[PDB]
Design a protein around this ligand. Structure first.
Ligand code: D7A
Ligand code: ZN
Length: 258
């Protein structure tokens, strides 16, 4: 009886094995754009992905991860709310069964079709495993997806998904450039939060871009053909792999833009 997104194992059940699910800085949250405040203390955000080295794509039974070589400083996030350097380790998405849902964060209660998470760890802690024992261990750059025009830079991901249909399947995935998944603007909201999947660890500085990227209907339809189950198990489409918004509690969401 593993955690998942179903009626008997989904987000309303996670707190039994992971009591931090009801903690003080859980993610995602609704971003009330009317209560978020511009923060002039925020430094310019620097997304430096030109030397990224992707390695592999993996269906882990809850999403698919594009993994990077993080053995050296190569693809890093710094600036904004962050102190020091955060190295990219993987990206993944959350998405819906229908175009009107799928994102984890919401913007004035609006759900997007999907949400991209670029996951980074603070190099002052040496390894990802040590980083997830720290309140400032991780930084996740979140990008909303809406359905409209295709995102050309996403197609190479779309086209490998047939090789990782089921849980535990991986494939080589070298030379993928995550710069092709960014929007034009780096305007963002930031707040302190958590992983949005078990173990729900409260280690994350969230940086959520305001401008969504557009993907085509056909691209997100291919996401929805993935499976949560393993090969030769009953087929459960990998859809609606999002956690709903959690209580903001004693947090303030800051805006990078006036
Ligand atoms: C060996 O030590 C660990 C290794 C990994 C983890 C956490 C695994 N989960 C994630 O890395 C992760 C989960 C959700 C996100 S999200 N959806 O918030 O971007 C990002 C990363 C926890 C660990 O320590 C228990
Ligand atoms: Zn995620």
């Amino acid at each position: 009886h593993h955690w998942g997104y179903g009626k008997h194992n989904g987000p309303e059940h996670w707190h039994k094995d992971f009591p931090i699910a009801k903690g003080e800085r859980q993610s995602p949250v609704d971003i009330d754009t009317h209560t978020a405040k511009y923060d002039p203390s925020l430094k310019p955000l620097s997304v430096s992905y030109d030397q990224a080295t992707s390695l592999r794509i993996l269906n882990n039974g809850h999403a698919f991860n594009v993994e990077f070589d993080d053995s050296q400083d190569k693809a890093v996030l710094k600036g904004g709310p962050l102190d020091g350097t955060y190295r990219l380790i993987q990206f993944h998405f959350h998405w819906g069964s229908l175009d009107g849902q799928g994102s984890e964060h919401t913007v004035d209660k609006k759900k997007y079709a999907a949400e991209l998470h670029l996951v980074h760890w603070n190099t002052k802690y040496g390894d990802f495993g040590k980083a997830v024992q720290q309140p400032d261990g991780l930084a996740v750059l979140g990008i909303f997806l809406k359905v409209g025009s295709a995102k050309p830079g996403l197609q190479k991901v779309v086209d490998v998904l047939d090789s990782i249909k089921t849980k535990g399947k991986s494939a080589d995935f070298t030379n993928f450039d995550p710069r092709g998944l960014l929007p034009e603007s780096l305007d963002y909201w930031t707040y302190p939060g958590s992983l949005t999947t078990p173990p729900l660890l409260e280690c994350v500085t969230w940086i959520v871009l305001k401008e969504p990227i557009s993907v085509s209907s056909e691209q997100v339809l291919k996401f929805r053909k993935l499976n949560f189950n393993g090969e030769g198990e009953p087929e459960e489409l990998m859809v609606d792999n999002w956690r709903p918004a959690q209580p903001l509690k004693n947090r303030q969401i800051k805006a990078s833009f006036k």
